[PDB]
């Protein structure tokens, strides 16, 4: 809704006595529901998302080191110790170095040396938990009335659903109401998945894969980075010093490792790039407006000429300049002579309530050459169409 | 030199009439050259390096995008154009998007859409060319004379070589001649020095040129193949999501884990190679062979201690002696004065008074006695060697 602009479009035709109609809604794709003597219903999946998901883990992929301290005792008497050894935010290594005369050591052999460095994570990846019962989804619904595209945003009724929400009613003024009985299909394995977000970008990843990452990781409460050694390298000691270096930024390797996973985008709410919604649509309470109106006989004008939609249909915008509340006769014939409709009207029973009103018509013409005829008499509009 | 402090130590003993002695020097490793009736020569490889190598390539491994511009025409109305399409520093894509009445074009079909973005490299890797004719190497040479460790840097002669033989004169001890050749692991014509921030490597040219990353030259600053770090997601209506790919520092470094390392002076030093040397020992003379024997009292400034080389070192002070030589032996008994030990510091010496002299001896296995001096003034130290 509106399904004319959305290129991936399916038509579902209801049977005359049908009360319910099955329809599955996919992302970037919409469905047009038709039923005899009833207005056409455009349905579409807008978003499937999660609100306020809980953090379970953080995984650092870029770390910086500060406050690098070194203690370098001599052989025999002396275990080396640094105060930074008993602090939580320090990556430390305890080793022994070859020392003797020349390094200020009265004996030749191994001297204890400890190197500690402040571990502070520059950039980390957030791992949120996904709950099925916290999933909400949004569906656009809009009836096929003669409305301008610039009025679509006024007509579209947007519906919000929860994980276990029930059938939802949508009433269109002067057209009755429809009922949507929808069910959400995740495409995710909650008991085995995380939301992994780096800076701006997010994914649906395997929990096992995330926990098996060889990178430092944190928790939801205490802020002490665990397994810091993954991003901190201690080179072999020379005399009384140790080269302590932080490893490279792991953004790239991670992202390349994430190329095939289901995508997620967080915006001012976590949108899911997948999934779909199974819906049962009640059409019986949907009524056609102005079936008893008189016929428009006044001069009409194509504000917008019949044009191809790519859906195998044609659309046009007709202005009714003088004609009062009246209905518009639109048919697609094989000739100017026979008044036999070979085309199918998607915008069922067109109407012009007020004057100078612009009304949008969509028709499914037959294959080949045809005539789009709108109105009667000398006032009627005819437009040549070819559809191989 | 001095090879005592360097734990990885080899001994090379020359034959009596030998004029030349072969020796191979590896990184962080030294050799002690001995020869009968001649002073011991400590040789070591300090550095093998390159001076001012020429930059040849750059390879961006982190890029940032700014100035994201987009131009979007409707179907059947023209190709979309941006001013930034013609600038050198912009990554651009031209595509077509699904359009119609839904986005405000009066026809349904493909509308031209172009997206450009300012490409600026945050962090890049420099690829220098390695010219073997710019390779220099440094060798420490130092004789085993009776000195203290704190005087070693004063005694040590440091030598520089490029891609002939160099003479090293020790005052009062003659001179040695080093005919050295440097062997490094480089296919100069098939290698780069690859430097990122602080760390550098010796990399293979093919690998460097085959990297799926944007690359530049030493001259003009126009980044080529910018698409390697820039992704244009499929167009929706009138926009395109333009993303810069992730920092490639980690993947690059992990791909480089096994390669030969390179560093800088705080002059690109190589973490490898070795030097093959021919050492001339004939012109080396021993000092103070005719000095009298120290008969006055001596004292251990530093007691005999294990070096880890199977040898022992000690520091002896001569306070009340004149220019004199010190008799050092290692016997298996205090009565028998028969030396079973090998003197590394050949013919110890005391030029001035209160002089402290370092003795290094290679004692025999088992129980032994280190004897310094004669008479009642002599120092004895029981030593055990497994």
């Amino acid at each position, epitope marked *: 809704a509106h399904c004319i602009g959305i290129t991936d479009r399916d038509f579902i035709e209801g049977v005359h006595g049908g009360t319910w109609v099955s329809a599955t809604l996919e992302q970037d794709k919409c469905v047009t529901v038709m039923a005899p003597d009833k207005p056409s219903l455009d349905i579409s999946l807008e978003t499937v998302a999660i609100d306020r998901p809980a953090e379970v883990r953080k995984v650092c992929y870029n770390a910086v080191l*500060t*406050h690098v301290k070194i*203690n*370098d005792k001599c052989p025999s008497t002396g275990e080396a110790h640094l105060a930074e050894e008993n602090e939580g935010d320090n990556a430390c290594k305890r080793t022994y170095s070859d020392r003797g005369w020349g*390094n*200020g*050591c009265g004996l030749f052999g191994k*001297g204890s040396i400890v190197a500690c460095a*402040k571990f502070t994570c520059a950039k980390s990846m957030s791992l949120f938990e996904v709950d099925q019962t916290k999933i909400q989804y949004v569906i656009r619904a809009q009836l096929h009335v003669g409305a301008k595209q610039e009025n679509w945003n006024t007509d579209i009724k947007t519906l919000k659903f929860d994980a276990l929400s029930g059938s939802q009613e949508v009433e269109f003024i002067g057209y009755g109401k429809a009922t949507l009985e929808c069910q959400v299909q995740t495409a995710v394995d909650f008991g085995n998945s995380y939301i992994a977000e780096m800076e701006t970008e997010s994914w649906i990843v395997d929990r096992q894969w995330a926990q098996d990452l060889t990178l430092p990781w944190q928790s939801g409460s205490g802020g002490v980075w665990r397994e810091m050694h993954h991003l901190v390298e201690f080179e072999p000691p020379h005399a009384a*010093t140790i080269r302590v270096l932080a490893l490279g930024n792991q953004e790239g390797s991670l992202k390349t490792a994430l190329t095939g996973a289901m995508r997620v985008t967080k915006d001012t709410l976590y949108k899911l790039h997948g999934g779909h919604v199974s819906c049962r649509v009640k059409l019986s309470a949907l009524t056609l407006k102005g079936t008893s109106y008189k016929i428009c006989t006044d001069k009409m004008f194509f504000v917008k000429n019949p044009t191809d939609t790519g859906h195998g249909t044609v659309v046009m915008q007709v202005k009714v300049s003088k004609g009062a509340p009246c209905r518009i006769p639109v048919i697609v014939a094989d000739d100017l002579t026979a008044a036999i409709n070979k085309g199918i009207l998607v915008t069922v029973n067109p109407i012009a309530s007020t004057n100078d009103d612009e009304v949008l018509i969509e028709v499914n013409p037959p294959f080949g050459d045809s005539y789009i005829i709108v109105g009667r008499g000398d006032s009627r509009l005819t437009y040549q169409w070819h559809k191989e | 030199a001095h090879c005592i402090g360097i734990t990885d130590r080899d001994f090379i003993e020359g034959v009596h009439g030998g004029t030349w002695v072969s020796a191979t020097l590896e990184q962080d490793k030294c050799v002690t050259v001995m020869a009968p009736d001649k002073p011991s020569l400590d040789i070591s490889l300090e550095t093998v390096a390159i001076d001012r190598p020429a930059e040849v390539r750059k390879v961006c491994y982190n890029a940032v995008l700014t100035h994201v511009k987009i131009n979007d025409k409707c179907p059947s109305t023209g190709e979309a154009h941006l001013a930034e399409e013609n600038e050198g520093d912009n990554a651009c894509k031209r595509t077509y998007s699904d359009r119609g009445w839904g986005n405000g074009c009066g026809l349904f079909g493909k509308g031209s859409i172009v997206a450009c973005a300012k490409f600026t490299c945050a962090k890049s890797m420099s690829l220098f060319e390695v010219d073997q004719t710019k390779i220099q190497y440094v060798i420490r040479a130092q004789l085993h004379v009776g000195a203290k460790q704190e005087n070693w840097n004063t005694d040590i002669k440091t030598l520089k070589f490029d891609a002939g033989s160099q003479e090293v004169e020790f005052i009062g001890y003659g001179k040695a001649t080093l005919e050295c050749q440097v062997q490094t692991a480089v296919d100069f014509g098939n290698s780069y020095i690859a430097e990122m921030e602080t760390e550098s490597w010796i990399v293979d040219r093919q690998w460097a040129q085959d990297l799926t990353l944007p690359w530049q030259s030493g001259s003009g600053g126009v980044w080529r193949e910018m698409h390697h770090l820039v992704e244009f997601e499929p167009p929706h209506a009138a926009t395109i999501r333009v993303l810069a790919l992730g920092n490639q520092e980690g993947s690059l470094k992990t791909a480089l884990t096994g390669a030969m390392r390179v560093t800088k002076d705080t002059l690109y030093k190589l973490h490898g190679g070795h030097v093959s040397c021919r050492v001339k020992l004939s012109a080396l003379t021993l000092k103070g062979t005719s000095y009298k024997i120290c008969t006055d009292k001596m004292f251990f400034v530093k007691n005999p201690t294990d070096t880890g080389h199977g040898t022992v070192v000690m520091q002896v002070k001569v306070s009340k002696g004149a220019p004199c030589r010190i008799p050092v032996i290692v016997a298996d008994d205090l009565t028998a004065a028969i030396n079973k030990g090998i003197l590394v510091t050949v013919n110890p010496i005391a030029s001035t008074n209160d002089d402290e002299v370092l003795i290094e001896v290679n004692p025999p296995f088992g129980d032994s006695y280190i004897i310094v001096g004669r008479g009642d003034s002599r120092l004895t130290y029981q030593w055990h060697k497994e």
Partner: antibody
Amino acid sequence: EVQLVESGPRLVKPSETLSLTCTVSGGSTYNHHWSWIRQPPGRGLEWIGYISYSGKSNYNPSLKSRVTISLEPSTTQFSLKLNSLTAADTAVYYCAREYRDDTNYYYYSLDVWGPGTMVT
Amino acid sequence: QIVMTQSPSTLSASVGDRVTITCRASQSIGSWLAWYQQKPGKAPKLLIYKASSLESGVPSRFSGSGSGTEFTLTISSLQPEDFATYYCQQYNNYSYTFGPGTKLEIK
């Protein structure tokens, strides 16, 4: 836990020399710059000077002509010797470690101090 | 020898206050500046190094800023511990120079 203790003659008559010694425990003296700093009663701190294991040393210009700082590496202790004393030299003398890491490029200035010793 | 000045000479304040001490070098010293806290009869303790970096484990209420000539030490919320004399010191190049000190006492 790197600790420094300075010791030596407490009461010094004028015109003599000052023999102070700082003893280093918990760490060797191969690294860092070992320094002396003094503080007269009721005034501010005056940086006297330093010496390293390398042999490189440096003294305060107002004191350079008199000050001699030496290093005994074996016992890991270093000594201050100030000549041509005066009433101005009456101060609390601290020995301190200037931490210098030339491998990872970290410098914390004087990070470890001794109790300080009062010379008159 | 580079000359260091401090301002103010003395500051009286109460517990819970925000205080800011200033330190000036005769010439640019980059960021190589240290802050020391000295209590009567005791040795100076290292608080800040490299202008802004805190020594572990100095309370996070302590902070430093500045580079070149101008420097400031800041205590966001004063405590009974903090009442002592604060000295600044340049260690960009020898000879090193301490400041005259800023005395901080209770009102």
